Amino acid sequence: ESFLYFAYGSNLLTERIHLRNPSAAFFCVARLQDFKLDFGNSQGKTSQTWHGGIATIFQSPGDEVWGVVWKMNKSNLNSLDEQEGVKSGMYVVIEVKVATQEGKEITCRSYLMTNYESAPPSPQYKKIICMGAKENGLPLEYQEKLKAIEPNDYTGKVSEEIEDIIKKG
Amino acid sequence: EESFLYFAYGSNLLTERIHLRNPSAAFFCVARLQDFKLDFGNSQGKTSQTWHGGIATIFQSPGDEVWGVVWKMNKSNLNSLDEQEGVKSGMYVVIEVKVATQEGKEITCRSYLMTNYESAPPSPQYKKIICMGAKENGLPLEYQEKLKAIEPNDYTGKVSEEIEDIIKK
Numbered sequence: 001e002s003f004l005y006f007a008y009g010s011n012l013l014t015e016r017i018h019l020r021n022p023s024a025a026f027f028c029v030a031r032l033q034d035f036k037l038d039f040g041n042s043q044g045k046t047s048q049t050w051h052g053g054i055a056t057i058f059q060s061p062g063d064e065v066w067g068v069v070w071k072m073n074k075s076n077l078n079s080l081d082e083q084e085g086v087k088s089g090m091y092v093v094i095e096v097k098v099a100t101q102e103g104k105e106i107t108c109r110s111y112l113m114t115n116y117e118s119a120p121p122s123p124q125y126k127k128i129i130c131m132g133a134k135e136n137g138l139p140l141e142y143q144e145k146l147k148a149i150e151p152n153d154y155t156g157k158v159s160e161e162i163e164d165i166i167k168k169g
Numbered sequence: 170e171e172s173f174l175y176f177a178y179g180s181n182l183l184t185e186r187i188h189l190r191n192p193s194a195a196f197f198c199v200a201r202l203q204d205f206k207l208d209f210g211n212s213q214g215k216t217s218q219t220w221h222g223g224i225a226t227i228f229q230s231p232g233d234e235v236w237g238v239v240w241k242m243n244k245s246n247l248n249s250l251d252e253q254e255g256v257k258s259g260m261y262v263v264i265e266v267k268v269a270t271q272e273g274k275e276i277t278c279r280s281y282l283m284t285n286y287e288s289a290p291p292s293p294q295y296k297k298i299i300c301m302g303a304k305e306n307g308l309p310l311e312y313q314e315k316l317k318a319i320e321p322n323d324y325t326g327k328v329s330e331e332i333e334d335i336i337k338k
Contacts, residue, residue, distance in 0.1 A: 034259050035284075043231075058284035058285045059213075059260075059262060059284045059285045060259070060285060061213070061258075061259055089229040089230070089231050090229075092229060092264050092266075092282070093264060093266075094262050094263060094264055094265075095263040095265070095279075096262075096263070109265075112284065114227075114228040114229045114282065114284075115228050115229045115230060
């Protein structure tokens with residue numbers, strides 16, 4: 001009756017995932033080996049939510065990505081696909097096998113872009129990813145990699161709910 | 170359940186090909202993936218030493234379509250098929266897609282695509298297999314025309330005796 005979702009983007013942050021998925025439950029932190037984090041514009045179009053590149057991953061040996069695994073009810077599948085832009089061609093659904101820090105492999109659903117042009121993330125998007133990694137105790141080493149991601153020069157505003165999340169943190 | 174559904178769009182269109190690593194695979198139906206374009210590429214910039222040209226992949230692209238075959242397989246087969254597509258070595262990533270049959274029924278399948286590749290044309294031997302299976306498994310004739318119109322590379326050496334034998338006849 002449930003599935004596991006691997007989040008490496010803005011759904012690292014508990015407050016953020018719950019906005020549209022309030023029943024999501026923290027399962028654990030995990031590592032996707034041989035993938036690399038990237039940001040970009042789907043179909044070459046800038047996200048009008050985030051106003052910068054949005055998170056995605058691709059196979060890259062030697063590389064890793066840390067994320068948070070959420071447990072969700074199977075009734076939320078279509079909604080999460082809808083959230084991630086699957087019908088509109090923004091992400092594709094993937095199955096990945098991630099590793100917990102005590103050596104356990106977990107099989108999860110996640111999402112990645114197949115057709116994007118690489119592009120830096122907006123500060124607010126960066127900040128949401130940073131807060132989520134810290135909230136959920138991703139490794140400090142990984143957090144520093146995130147802190148070092150150069151953002152674009154967007155100086156306007158995102159949605160008030162996001163903009164208010166940031167003011168709290 | 171006991172079973173899962175797999176959507177082949179490359180060399181596993183051919184029954185004789187799929188059956189050599191997955192003998193219990195059974196034909197389910199022919200189906201269409203919307204807003205996806207077929208391509209051929211070298212994963213990680215490595216040429217297939219099996220096929221000696223670009224091997225098949227898909228990416229999201231509104232407007233276009235990819236036709237293929239849905240195979241029904243035992244869920245005991247899962248790991249095997251992953252090994253076959255080199256998931257662990259970063260050659261393909263596992264995806265979920267929804268496909269429509271010619272009578273309009275939507276199906277949820279497993280498939281694969283490449284996340285990190287250079288575009289490269291397929292070998293003549295590979296194109297044949299793909300065409301042989303498009304034909305044998307009743308893919309629509311206009312789509313067969315599209316496959317037939319693929320420009321192969323100039324490779325005219327030996328492939329594996331098993332692949333060369335399938336082709337002869």
